[PDB]
């Protein structure tokens, strides 16, 4: 042939060499540009199709309710002291060894201060006794920002105080504070007399969802502690009048029901495993999820 092609080159200098024409081991600034541009418009418009197809999916979800909930289906039971490894270990006598546990628990409970629940428009007064599900309405923008069922620091017996800067919390014999996971549109159902609990059904079958903290499981276990459940109405569980929950979009400052457990045992200098459990029909448990509807906190008051 007479056609000039192939690579009969004899310069590894061509890696950057260009005195002829082409450069950077590449081609000319006209094709070194041209293909660059290709990828520019290719990746460009390609990114547009990801953009576009993401957009279509977005308008298949209501910004009021999740299209799916079956994966958070039964809620789990979570404490407010930031469990190190589910363990709350400290030296009762020394302030330092728990100051961490305090700043965490204190920061959370500043959402529930009385000075924070000021205005009557956003915050509504739900009775000083646990009632039935105050159903705000239909999960839309029909009725605007739904009212927030208030919750007073004082209901949490003995774990509220009123100091200066930082809350003066429990150094000798700690205060664990239990909470329920916010499921949008959920309504707790308290146990009847059939599927009874590991303990005698403390009163309020109608409107309280029971929470009981025993030792490590139920079988042969070193039971060494003094439980003491503090709450609204003085009942060991959750006030149904706070549910259902209507999302961050419809309830921006919604305060969920709290319920504390000041553990004032009779055995220092040792670690003990204690399992809390929320009993009910709308509450489930999992052998794998150590937090689903239950609790496994191990605390050590080693002074």
């Amino acid at each position: 042939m007479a056609r000039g092609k192939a690579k009969e080159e004899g310069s590894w200098k061509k890696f950057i060499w260009n005195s002829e024409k082409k450069e950077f081991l590449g081609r000319t600034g006209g094709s070194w540009f041209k293909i660059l541009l290709f990828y520019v418009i290719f990746y460009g418009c390609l990114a547009g199709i990801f953009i576009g197809t993401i957009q279509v999916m977005l308008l298949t979800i209501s910004e009021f309710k999740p299209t799916y909930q079956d994966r958070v289906a039964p809620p789990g039971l979570t404490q407010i002291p930031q469990s190190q490894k589910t363990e709350i270990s400290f030296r009762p006598n020394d302030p330092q060894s728990y100051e961490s546990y305090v700043v965490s628990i204190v920061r959370f409970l500043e959402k529930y201060k009385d000075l924070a629940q000021k205005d009557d428009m956003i915050f509504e007064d739900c009775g000083n006794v646990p009632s039935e599900l105050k159903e705000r309405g239909e999960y839309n923008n029909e009725r605007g920002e739904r009212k927030v069922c208030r919750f007073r620091l004082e209901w949490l017996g003995n774990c509220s105080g009123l100091n200066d800067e930082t809350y003066g919390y429990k150094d000798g014999k700690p205060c664990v504070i239990i909470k329920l996971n916010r499921v949008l549109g959920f309504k707790p159902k308290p146990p009847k007399n059939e599927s009874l609990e590991t303990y005698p059904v403390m009163k309020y079958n109608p409107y309280v969802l029971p929470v009981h903290c025993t030792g490590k499981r139920d079988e042969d276990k070193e039971k060494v502690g003094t439980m003491e459940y503090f709450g609204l109405g003085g009942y060991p569980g959750f006030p149904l009048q706070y549910y259902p929950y209507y999302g961050k979009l419809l309830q921006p400052k919604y305060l969920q029901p709290l319920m504390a457990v000041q553990f004032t045992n009779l055995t220092m200098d040792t670690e003990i495993r204690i399992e809390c459990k929320a009993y009910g029909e709308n509450i489930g448990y999992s052998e794998k999820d150590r937090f689903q509807g239950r609790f496994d906190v191990k605390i050590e008051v080693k002074s």
């Binding site: 799916y68 909930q69 079956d70 289906a73 549109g185 709308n282």
Partner: protein, 34 residues
Amino acid sequence: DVDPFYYDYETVRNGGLIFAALAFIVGLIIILSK
């Protein structure tokens, strides 16, 4: 069966296994087409 809120995975799972058997079997029948 039906109650509060959740997703029936029983049928979704058996429906998908029915398919996995279609793909598998038709897959073999093609590669052995007499």
